[PDB]
Write a protein that holds these residues in place. Structure first.
Motif, short mmCIF file in Angstrom:
data_model
loop_
_atom_site.label_atom_id
_atom_site.label_comp_id
_atom_site.label_asym_id
_atom_site.label_seq_id
_atom_site.Cartn_x
_atom_site.Cartn_y
_atom_site.Cartn_z
N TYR A 77 -2.49 0.47 -4.52
CA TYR A 77 -2.36 -0.85 -3.90
C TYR A 77 -1.79 -1.84 -4.90
O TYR A 77 -2.19 -1.86 -6.07
N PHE A 79 3.04 -0.71 8.58
CA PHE A 79 3.43 0.57 8.00
C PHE A 79 4.93 0.80 8.16
O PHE A 79 5.54 0.41 9.16
N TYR A 131 0.35 5.40 0.91
CA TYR A 131 -0.54 6.37 1.53
C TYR A 131 0.14 7.72 1.62
O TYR A 131 1.35 7.80 1.87
N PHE A 171 0.83 -1.19 0.00
CA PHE A 171 0.00 0.00 0.00
C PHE A 171 0.87 1.25 0.00
O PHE A 171 1.95 1.27 0.59
N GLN A 209 -5.68 16.12 6.44
CA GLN A 209 -6.48 15.02 5.91
C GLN A 209 -6.06 13.65 6.44
O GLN A 209 -6.70 12.66 6.08
N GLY A 210 -5.03 13.58 7.27
CA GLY A 210 -4.61 12.28 7.80
C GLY A 210 -4.08 11.38 6.70
O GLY A 210 -3.40 11.82 5.77
N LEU A 211 -4.40 10.09 6.81
CA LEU A 211 -3.97 9.10 5.84
C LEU A 211 -4.94 9.06 4.66
O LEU A 211 -6.15 8.96 4.85
N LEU A 216 -2.09 -4.19 8.69
CA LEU A 216 -1.20 -3.50 7.77
C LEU A 216 0.05 -3.08 8.53
O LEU A 216 -0.05 -2.45 9.59
N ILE A 261 -3.38 -2.90 -8.87
CA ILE A 261 -4.77 -3.31 -8.75
C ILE A 261 -5.70 -2.11 -8.57
O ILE A 261 -6.71 -1.98 -9.27
N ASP A 262 -5.36 -1.22 -7.64
CA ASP A 262 -6.20 -0.05 -7.36
C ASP A 262 -5.30 1.17 -7.20
O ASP A 262 -4.46 1.21 -6.30
N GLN A 283 0.20 11.09 3.90
CA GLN A 283 -0.13 11.54 5.24
C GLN A 283 0.07 13.04 5.32
O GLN A 283 1.17 13.54 5.03
N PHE A 343 -5.51 7.06 0.90
CA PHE A 343 -5.10 5.97 0.03
C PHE A 343 -4.59 6.51 -1.30
O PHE A 343 -5.18 7.43 -1.88
N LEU A 391 3.58 7.39 3.34
CA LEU A 391 3.72 6.13 4.04
C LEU A 391 3.54 4.95 3.09
O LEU A 391 2.78 5.03 2.12
N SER A 429 -6.90 4.39 -7.30
CA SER A 429 -7.95 5.40 -7.27
C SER A 429 -7.54 6.66 -6.51
O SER A 429 -8.10 7.73 -6.76
#
Ligand SMILES: *[C@@H]1O[C@H](CO)[C@@H](O)[C@H](O)[C@H]1NC(C)=O
Ligand SMILES: *[C@@H]1O[C@H](CO)[C@@H](O)[C@H](O)[C@H]1NC(C)=O
Ligand code: NA
Lengths: 182, 177, 242, 13, 186
Positions: free
Chosen positions: C47, C103, C34, C32, C40-42, C101, C54-55, C36, C44, C90, C57
């Motif tokens: 992936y 990290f 990410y 993954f 807005q924090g974490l 997960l 795969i993703d 940070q 996505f 991250l 988005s």
């Protein structure tokens, strides 16, 4: 073996080596709900009306293909590289609806006992190959872990027309042709 | 020299979602070696090939896999299958032709539950009737052929009687010489 | 084990190409990425499973891309770096479906408008107040790192050649020297409290270490002043018997 | 309305 | 989208803390919680799945309301070690986790023997600044208004040699008209 009112096949994944051949499908009561076009990364519903109501993100198809890529490598090494044995498919030609001259119909070639799921299903019109008007389903799973595939030829019945469904598979010494006439 | 791996997730439903069975299959070359069965409740090696992996799957994925009975099987059935697959109703198309033997062709219907009977001058025929197995066209429609062996006479009427969940009343088609 | 991300810090100017490296835990097929940020924090980004994308988005639709050349390293490439790209990126690996997960520590990336405004910190240590020792029988040292930009610093206390964590308190966030300017230099304060006896021992060595992250060797520098490379700036003190 | 896949879990190899 | 409230949570030692998250995607079925200490990496501390409603593991409680589409984490008997940044997430499948904005949880120390006093530290031969220290005050604290006078925020240190923790704030200035008398409440 397991008796139930309804059975849903979710997450069905097939992967092959070499060549990177993969398939991901869903089924309900023996009928294909959808497959995921791995090249285009798009979900393709057998009934488009279903896809207008139900969302399946194609990521699930890609993820299971990728994990099966890993699993095939593990099991091939563990099995001392035991290869798959090519079975001989069996074919059957029948019309979707009773055949009336001039009314459009569909010739269905039902081919069973497909393993591994690599097959060439082609149609012959007057012993010549027909390219347009042909559609085939995904490899549908069997309880004995072989596959079956159906091919459809949309045609107009005519007096001067005879049709053949030609099947080509590694487990066949020569291609099998199943004939159909009105 | 080709090698195949298969993954099969299966949800079994009985009486709506009152009884759900979740089965997960890992197959190498048509050999299922590892299987999760919600009735068993844990991963089990099916053949020789899965003894090295059965305990690992139970030690890493068991609790998550068990939740998939509700998370996946119950969710998929209740939210997606009831408005699309369990609501599908296709009315059969009935036609009679002579081959002698009369062939009643009942086609393009869904779901599978169907009753087709042969009548001659108002009396049901059973002795000479032979039916094909239910034929799955692969396009979410079924078809079935029902044969009646008879001798055609001048004034006889042969009727094919079809009942289906998509029919409020049965379909009747008569055949005469 | 642990996910290893490199570099820990990256300071670059507008228009450069930055690539971020992540080493998943051995045996982990799921990877993954990410972003940070404090607001807005974490978030996505992308992936991977078994090297297959795969993703994606959450990826920005331009200048951003992610790759997995082999099964053990994943790269996050940013082209034509811009200031809004500044965030902690991250990376996370996992080996179970919908489970833990793992990290990494992340790569803190800062994209600055002008690299002329990056400066290293000035570090000074101030010896404990005698009144504090008299009343509390304890001695508080204070370390001040001032006039640094950007805020990529890591402060450590080193007593007798060994890093110490007990008795230490560093400011959670640095303060702006000139809060009006948005390119303002920063200041950071830390405290080390020890017993009165420990400070009164003249053989005890107190060193405040501030690791600063700035330009690298591959960065051009045209101004006359010393180029502010990634460097350690320290201030030291010894125990005092008066 | 969203249908969920049953997910392949990795073999320990 | 996952909305996490509150963004900042100040709680006193021994009291309970509660973080509430809501999600839009009704297909979400996995809800982990991640704890991040500053500079360190997020670490999973507790989770829950759609088939469950409550889970208690050693002073951590997670609730799930599938109908209301909300899930919450509850830290009973908060400790200073729990002071960190907390992230909640909602996953439909394995290929994407949707995280919240985070909650900065500050567990405030229960200072036992407050001794508020301001002290001036000796100047350095390498810096032209006088440094004042406001230390040993209790949970209630004030921070600052002048230019070229810098005051940091409060900071709790734990020596762990003794059983003594304490709060501290630092003020410093270049100017000659600077005094430690009222440099922290001006
Ligand atoms: C299918 O046909 C293509 C060309 O039409 C051929 O290259 C391929 O080998 C065939 N596959 C099989 C299994 O016969
Ligand atoms: C089917 O399930 C319902 C509850 O959903 C129950 O009331 C009913 O008795 C069940 N049917 C049978 C035959 O057990
Ligand atoms: Na977020």
């Amino acid at each position: 073996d397991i008796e139930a009112d309804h059975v849903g096949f979710y997450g069905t994944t097939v992967y092959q080596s070499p060549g990177d051949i993969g398939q991901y499908t869903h089924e309900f009561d023996g009928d294909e709900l959808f497959y995921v076009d791995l090249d285009k990364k798009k979900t393709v519903w057998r009934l488009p009306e279903f896809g207008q109501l139900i969302l399946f993100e194609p990521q699930g198809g890609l993820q299971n293909i990728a994990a099966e890529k890993h699993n095939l490598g593990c099991l091939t090494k563990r099995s001392n590289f035991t290869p798959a044995t090519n079975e001989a498919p069996q074919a059957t030609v029948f019309p979707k609806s009773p055949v009336l001259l001039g009314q459009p119909n569909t010739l269905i070639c039902f081919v069973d006992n497909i393993f591994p799921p690599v097959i060439n299903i082609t149609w012959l019109r007057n012993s010549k190959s027909v390219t347009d008007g042909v559609y085939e389903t995904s490899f549908l799973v069997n309880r004995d872990h072989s596959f079956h595939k159906l091919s459809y030829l949309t045609f107009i019945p005519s007096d001067d027309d005879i049709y053949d469904c030609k099947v080509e598979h590694w487990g066949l010494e020569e291609p099998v042709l199943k004939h159909w006439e009105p | 020299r080709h090698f195949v791996h298969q993954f099969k997730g299966e949800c079994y439903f009985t009486n709506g979602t009152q009884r759900i069975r979740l089965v997960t299959r890992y197959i190498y070359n048509r050999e299922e070696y590892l299987r999760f069965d919600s009735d068993v409740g844990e991963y089990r090696a099916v053949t020789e090939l899965g003894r090295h992996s059965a305990e690992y799957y139970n030690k890493q994925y068991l609790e998550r896999t068990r939740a998939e009975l509700d998370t996946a099987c119950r969710h998929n059935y209740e939210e997606t299958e009831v408005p699309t697959s369990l609501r599908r109703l296709e009315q059969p198309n009935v036609a009679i032709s002579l081959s002698n033997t009369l062939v009643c062709s009942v086609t393009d219907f869904y779901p599978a539950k169907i009753k087709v009977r042969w009548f001659r001058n108002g009396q049901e025929e059973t002795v000479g009737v032979s039916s094909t197995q239910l034929i799955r066209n692969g396009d979410w429609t079924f078809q079935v052929l029902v044969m009646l062996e008879m001798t055609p006479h001048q004034g006889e009427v042969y009727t094919c009687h079809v009942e289906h969940p998509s029919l409020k009343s049965p379909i009747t088609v008569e055949w005469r010489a | 084990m642990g996910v290893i991300q490199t570099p820990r810090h990256k300071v670059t100017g507008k228009g450069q190409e930055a690539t971020l490296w992540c080493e998943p835990i051995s045996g982990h097929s799921a990877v993954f990425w990410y972003r940070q940020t404090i607001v807005q924090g974490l978030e996505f980004l992308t992936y991977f499973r078994n090297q297959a994308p795969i993703d994606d988005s959450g990826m920005p639709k331009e200048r951003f891309s992610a790759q997995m050349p082999n099964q053990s390293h994943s790269t996050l490439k940013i082209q034509s770096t811009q200031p809004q790209d500044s965030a902690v990126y991250l990376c996370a690996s996992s080996r179970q479906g919908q489970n833990t997960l793992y990290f990494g520590a992340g790569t803190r990336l800062s994209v600055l408008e002008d690299l002329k405004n990056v400066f290293p910190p000035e570090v000074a240590v101030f010896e404990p107040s005698e009144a504090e020792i008299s009343h509390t029988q304890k001695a508080t040292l204070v370390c001040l790192a001032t006039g640094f930009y950007p805020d990529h610093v890591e402060l450590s206390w080193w007593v007798n050649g060994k890093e110490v964590h007990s008795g230490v308190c560093t400011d959670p966030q640095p303060l702006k020297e000139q809060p009006a300017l948005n390119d303002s230099r920063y200041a950071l304060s830390s405290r080390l409290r020890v017993s009165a006896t420990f400070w009164q021992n003249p053989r005890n060595h107190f060193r405040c270490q501030v690791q600063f992250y700035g330009l690298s060797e591959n960065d051009e520098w045209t101004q006359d002043r010393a180029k502010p490379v990634t460097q350690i700036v320290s201030a030291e003190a010894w125990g005092r018997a008066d | 309305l969203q249908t969920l896949a049953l997910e392949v879990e990795d073999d320990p190899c | 989208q996952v909305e996490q409230l509150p963004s900042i949570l100040r709680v006193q030692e021994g009291s309970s803390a509660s973080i509430n998250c809501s999600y839009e995607d009704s297909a979400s079925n996995y809800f982990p919680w991640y704890k991040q200490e500053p500079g360190e990496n997020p670490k999973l501390i507790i989770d829950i799945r759609s088939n469950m409603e409550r889970k208690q593991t050693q002073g951590l409680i997670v609730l799930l309301d599938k109908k209301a589409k909300r899930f919450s984490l509850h830290i009973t008997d908060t400790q200073p070690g729990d002071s960190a940044m907390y992230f909640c997430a909602a996953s439909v499948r394995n290929y994407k986790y949707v995280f919240g904005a985070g909650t900065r949880l500050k567990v405030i120390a229960d200072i036992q023997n407050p001794d508020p006093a301001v002290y001036q530290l000796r100047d350095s031969k390498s810096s032209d600044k006088s440094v004042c220290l406001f230390t040993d005050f209790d949970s209630q604290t004030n921070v600052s208004k002048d230019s070229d006078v810098y005051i940091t925020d409060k900071c709790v240190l734990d020596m762990r040699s003794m059983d003594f923790k304490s709060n501290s704030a630092v003020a410093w200035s270049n100017k000659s008209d600077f005094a430690c008398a009222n440099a922290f409440n001006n």
